[PDB]
Paper text:
This synergism elicited by RAPTA-T and AUF appears to be mediated via an allosteric mechanism within the nucleosome, which has biological implications and may open up new avenues for drug development beyond metal-based drugs.
We next conducted co-treatment trials with RAPTA-T and AUF simultaneously present in the treatment buffer and observed that both ruthenium and gold adducts are generated readily at distinct histone sites. The triethylphosphine groups make extensive hydrophobic contacts with surrounding H3 residues, which entail interactions with both copies of H3 for a given adduct. The requirement for the presence of both RAPTA-T and AUF in the NCP treatments to allow gold adduct formation at AU1 and AU1′ suggests that the RAPTA-T adducts promote reactivity of the H3/H3′ H113 sites. However, the closest distance between any two adduct atoms of RU1/RU2 and AU1/AU1′ is 27 Å. In the RAPTA-T/AUF–NCP crystal structure, there are two equivalents each of ruthenium and gold per nucleosome.
Numbering used by the authors:
A (entry chain B): 21 to 102
B (entry chain F): 16 to 102
C (entry chain A), D (entry chain E): 38 to 134
E (entry chain G), F (entry chain C): 14 to 119
G (entry chain H), H (entry chain D): 28 to 122
Write the structure that this text describes.
Amino acid sequence: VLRDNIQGITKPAIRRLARRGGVKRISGLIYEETRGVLKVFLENVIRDAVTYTEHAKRKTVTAMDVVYALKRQGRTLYGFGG
Amino acid sequence: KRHRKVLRDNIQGITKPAIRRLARRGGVKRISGLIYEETRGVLKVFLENVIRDAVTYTEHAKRKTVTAMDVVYALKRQGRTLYGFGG
Amino acid sequence: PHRYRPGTVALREIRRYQKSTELLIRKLPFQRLVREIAQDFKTDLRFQSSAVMALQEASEAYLVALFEDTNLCAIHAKRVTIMPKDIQLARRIRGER
Amino acid sequence: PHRYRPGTVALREIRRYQKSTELLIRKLPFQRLVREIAQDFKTDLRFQSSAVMALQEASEAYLVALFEDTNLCAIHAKRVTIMPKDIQLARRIRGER
Amino acid sequence: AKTRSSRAGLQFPVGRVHRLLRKGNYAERVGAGAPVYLAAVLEYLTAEILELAGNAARDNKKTRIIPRHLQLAVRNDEELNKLLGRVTIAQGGVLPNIQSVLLPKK
Amino acid sequence: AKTRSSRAGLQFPVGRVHRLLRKGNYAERVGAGAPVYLAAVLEYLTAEILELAGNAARDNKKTRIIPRHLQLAVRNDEELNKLLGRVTIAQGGVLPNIQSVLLPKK
Amino acid sequence: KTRKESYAIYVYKVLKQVHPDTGISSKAMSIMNSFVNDVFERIAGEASRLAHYNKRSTITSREIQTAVRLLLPGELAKHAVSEGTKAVTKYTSAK
Amino acid sequence: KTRKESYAIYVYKVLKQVHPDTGISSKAMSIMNSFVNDVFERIAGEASRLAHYNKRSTITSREIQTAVRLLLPGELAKHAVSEGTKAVTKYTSAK
DNA sequence: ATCAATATCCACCTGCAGATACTACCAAAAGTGTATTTGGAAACTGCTCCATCAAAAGGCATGTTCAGCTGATTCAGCTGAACATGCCTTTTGATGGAGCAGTTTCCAAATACACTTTTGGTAGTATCTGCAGGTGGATATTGAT
DNA sequence: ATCAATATCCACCTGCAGATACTACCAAAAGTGTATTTGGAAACTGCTCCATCAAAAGGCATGTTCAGCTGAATCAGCTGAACATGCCTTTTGATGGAGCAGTTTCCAAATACACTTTTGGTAGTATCTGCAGGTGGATATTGAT
Ligand SMILES: [Mg+2]
């Protein structure tokens, strides 16, 4: 049952997130759109994290690699160090 | 110095035509009558925030004159960096 | 023979999910998506457990909040149904576009 | 007796103002407004003239961008007329509230 | 020997704060009061949040503060919310809030 | 008797860039390559903008680059537009752009 | 093996003064720790900038003060400034 | 009559290189001057943090390099990295 | 209205994941006493440019008019919500091994210091030139018809 | 479509602002060279904690049904654009001093270095408990009628 990983982010999971955000009714096209948006988000953050990893001459992305990437992307996260 | 003129209601020097021009540069075709007061408000908040920080820099430096640089630094802090005035 | 009206369960879920804090995407699917994306940047990468967690926390926060602005955009256009345009308008005004 | 249809001068103006770069708020009025607000934070202050210019350049740049965003909000609503609600939607989404 | 914190009446480490400032390349030099001042401010802000998060714990019939309690504390206070307005608290969820036009009709 | 700039094949000033790195307290120490590499990046970016600004000047039949040309350069280039997405060029104006639905007829 | 520092115990001391019967989860304490580090960096960062703008080699409480004013919202700034000037007075007079 | 430094003559050299018959207004030069100072500060900052994160006391051309990859978008980063690498290589061999 | 299906509420119970407690420990900060280096307020004064006055250039305020936009009403049809569960993917837990992190080493490269030269700034007085803002004159756009 | 009122686009010109120029000079640069300090790569290695996978858990892909939302069509009322008109306010150019900013002296304060005292992170072993997750039954809510 060959399938892209992006599709692992399923309708019901996206629906749950919408719900937490106070969304009552959802157009069918939202699911593909959201996947698109999430992919760009992860790309931007991951790119920056990995860049930290490579710099530290490591092969493991550390939570601190992510935390720092989030900080410079203007999305400071609390609870994973730093 | 003898006497020092009272400043009041100056927000109103931001005239209806001047606000229409800015809308135009911003690509706006039609403007409801209520936009002008709303814009005056928004501008006032914008200026307060920038002037507070600018003036804070002034005072920290023990000066009485607000510099182009005080404003430039204030603008930077608030994520509205300006080029053309020394920064 | 008992059916709930459209939107009753929708409201019910809003209340439920606004009350909890668990992550709402399944850990595994998300972990694969992360690794796949990272592969285009460097191969043979390993990820701390907490690093994947941090990414999830941040992604879901991001997406939950974007659904707020999106919802406001739908409401602005006198609707109750979020549409791709609403996401688009939100991201444009946020300066993501 | 001759007349342009409403909207024709408006578009004329958009082309005109989008083509130029001069400040669109009158200098002195803007200057009083600065001095007023500042005085309310602190008395007996002076301003380098370029500091006023800096503020004016920033303020007009801020306001012109806000109107594009505002304009988008109207259009999203299937209108061509900007209203306070549009400015408000823009500023919420922008995270100015 | 008596800690600079106890001299300044503070639970927060004036010593450590001093050190961290030097090895931070913030400036060539560091005056003696700066870490005291800085440490007070951090203590202060810690207290405020802990107070409100405690209250938030109480409301929900709890004695152990969790992330959810820090989130409710921060986003229900105008000033804390603004200071932390580009910050995400892991495992905090959101404030219950539903747009009224989405409520069913009476 | 040779400057480091000529040694590195650069117009931009390596000495100056070295000096400014030290006084900016970015770290205890500054390696020898850093000002070289940075001065090169600086020079690259300024060349890139000047190229594009020059073209805007010429497209307007002008010989002297003014702020409007810098703005046309930056805003017309996807990458320079993002690098400077939170920056304002005094006297730059905006890009001509009227949204479709605003135009006459159908 | 290497000692990993934290503000965790000072946060904990302050918790007790404020709510002596109330505890704190690991995850919560981590968040509190982030918070302190964050605000630390924001304040120091601004103070650094201030010193530089004014061609000064030293970060003094005056810089931390102005830093606090610039960074903190209205009421929070005021109280923090007072706690700050307080702590320095108390520290000076103490022998 | 204190000496106010800028990047103006270097911007002018580079200007001559790319557009030999084109001049630049002093306001346009001011913005050019601001832009270099800006990018300088932004790269130096990222470099600064990066060093710290890696418990390094030295900012090398390696730090600048990552800062550039962090700060700039795709194609500008690729090309800026060439030109800086090129300059360092040519700097090393030139003594 | 009533009636019933189901969601929601509160109380009480219980095992253990996750909290607080603890002592050794030792190592590494933080504080204490001595000698050194350095920064920046105060005192003074040149001198830039800021505040504050009168004359000329044109943009603002206001009323009138009606074009066309907005927002109400209605309505057909399309589209997303709700629904039941076996089925397939995720979760939980069990176990080697990559690699990260701790440690020690030693040297290439960085800091420091001291003449030595070069250069980037300004200042004075001059000298050149792109173009903004005026004119008139030929072609597009717009709206009535 | 045709006519015509009005904006728009050229082209050509000309004063002059503001730009390029240059000659004198200099202080603060950058450069050069020699002495001394050390950061971090480099290399070995110990133990997390990470990928992998088998077994146990349980959330979701499915298609069917229709309530109720979205969006097109229509229209009246009225807001906001255009424009004419009278003139107030800003803009432009030319004359007094508050305060900035540049020099210097001088001590109050921060650095440094070495020393001696404690605190705070870990690990060890055990010590303790707040509450998530389950039960039961009473009551609220929603939807059918
Ligand atoms: Mg006032």
